[PDB]
Enzyme design. Structure first.
Site, short mmCIF file in Angstrom:
data_model
loop_
_atom_site.label_atom_id
_atom_site.label_comp_id
_atom_site.label_asym_id
_atom_site.label_seq_id
_atom_site.Cartn_x
_atom_site.Cartn_y
_atom_site.Cartn_z
N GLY A 16 -5.23 -10.05 5.20
CA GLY A 16 -5.59 -10.03 6.61
C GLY A 16 -6.60 -8.99 7.05
O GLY A 16 -7.63 -8.80 6.40
N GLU A 17 -6.30 -8.31 8.16
CA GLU A 17 -7.20 -7.31 8.75
C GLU A 17 -6.50 -6.51 9.85
O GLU A 17 -5.67 -7.04 10.59
CB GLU A 17 -8.46 -7.98 9.32
CG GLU A 17 -8.21 -9.20 10.22
CD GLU A 17 -8.22 -8.86 11.70
OE1 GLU A 17 -7.21 -9.14 12.38
OE2 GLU A 17 -9.23 -8.33 12.20
N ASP A 122 1.66 2.93 -5.01
CA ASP A 122 0.21 2.73 -4.94
C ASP A 122 -0.48 3.84 -4.16
O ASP A 122 -1.28 3.59 -3.26
CB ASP A 122 -0.13 1.36 -4.33
CG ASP A 122 -1.58 0.96 -4.56
OD1 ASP A 122 -2.16 0.29 -3.68
OD2 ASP A 122 -2.23 1.28 -5.59
#
Ligand SMILES: C[C@@H](O)CNc1ncnc2[nH]c(-c3ccccc3)c(-c3ccccc3)c12
Length: 268
Positions: A16-17, A122
């Protein structure tokens, strides 16, 4: 008070964004991670569920979510400083005192996470966001997971993260502990802040640069730019055997970690 205008698209994830979201009357700006589960009800359901647990000053706050049929909306603390990636100049890094300050704040969040039994999986400068006072904020729990529940550790077997920041046991062993994998990635982050480059593409024997590090050839590039004190911490962090690897309580007792370098706030 809740009618959130989407001012300006701010960044773009693979999923997505993100958009800036300033309120009407209060003007309370937030970040709005937007992901179409079609373009699932589990990979982002775990990100939200982990987020609901998290409440630390060095961890991007989670305000809420809304369902909206197909697309999910994640409402999160706004960090106007952006990524720590952009405060690292290529081939130089950054002033040593800024590095130490960002590392204190990276350890603070990572300790907190490990205390509530979750691992980020991460950690990299792109997932470390600065706010307006430049305070660091551990971002993106999309790959995060529970390694401890009811005081029982479970090991990980799912391989995930980013190759240059990933620990060697992630590639070799079938199963491994969570906490030392995070410590490794934090040590890669320290290297980037102090040298302006990543040491290797991956911690595999098939990688020349990793074998040179194991042979203690610290006259080669990443490490020659560093300095004895911080390099000695990286020597204790970037240890191939995760059992022999330094733990966070012992990172707090390290010489360089407690070396005074940085002043207070100017006129505050
Ligand atoms: C999973 C999320 O935590 C990631 N998004 C954010 N969440 C909260 N605050 C954020 N600030 C930024 C940011 C990006 C660029 C410039 C300034 C801020 C962002 C940001 C940063 C990079 C890409 C997209 C958004 C941000």
């Amino acid at each position: 008070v809740e009618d959130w205008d989407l001012v300006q698209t701010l960044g773009e994830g693979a999923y997505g964004e993100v958009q800036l979201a300033v309120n009407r009357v209060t003007e309370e700006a937030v970040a709005v991670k937007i992901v179409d589960m079609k373009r699932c009800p589990e990979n982002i359901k775990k990100e939200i569920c982990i987020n609901k647990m998290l409440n630390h000053e060095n961890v991007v706050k989670f305000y809420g979510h809304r369902r909206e049929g197909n697309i999910q909306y994640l409402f999160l603390e706004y960090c106007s400083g952006g990524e720590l990636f952009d405060r690292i100049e290529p081939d130089i890094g950054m002033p040593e005192p800024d590095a130490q300050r960002f590392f204190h704040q990276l350890m603070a969040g990572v300790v907190y996470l490990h205390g509530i039994g979750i691992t980020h999986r991460d950690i990299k400068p792109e997932n470390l966001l600065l706010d307006e006072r430049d305070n660091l904020k551990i971002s993106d729990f999309g790959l995060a997971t529970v390694f401890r529940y009811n005081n029982r550790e479970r090991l990980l077997n799912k391989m995930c993260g980013t190759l240059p920041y990933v620990a060697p046991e992630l590639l070799k062993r079938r199963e491994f502990h969570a906490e030392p994998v995070d410590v490794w990635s934090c040590g890669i982050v320290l290297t980037a802040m102090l040298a302006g480059e990543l040491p290797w593409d991956q911690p595999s024997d098939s990688c020349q640069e990793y074998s040179d590090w194991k042979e203690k050839k610290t006259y080669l590039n990443p490490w020659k730019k560093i300095d004895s004190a911080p390099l000695a911490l990286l020597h204790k962090i970037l240890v191939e055997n995760p059992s022999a690897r330094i733990t966070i309580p012992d990172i707090k007792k390290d010489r360089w970690y407690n070396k005074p370098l940085k002043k207070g706030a100017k006129r505050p």
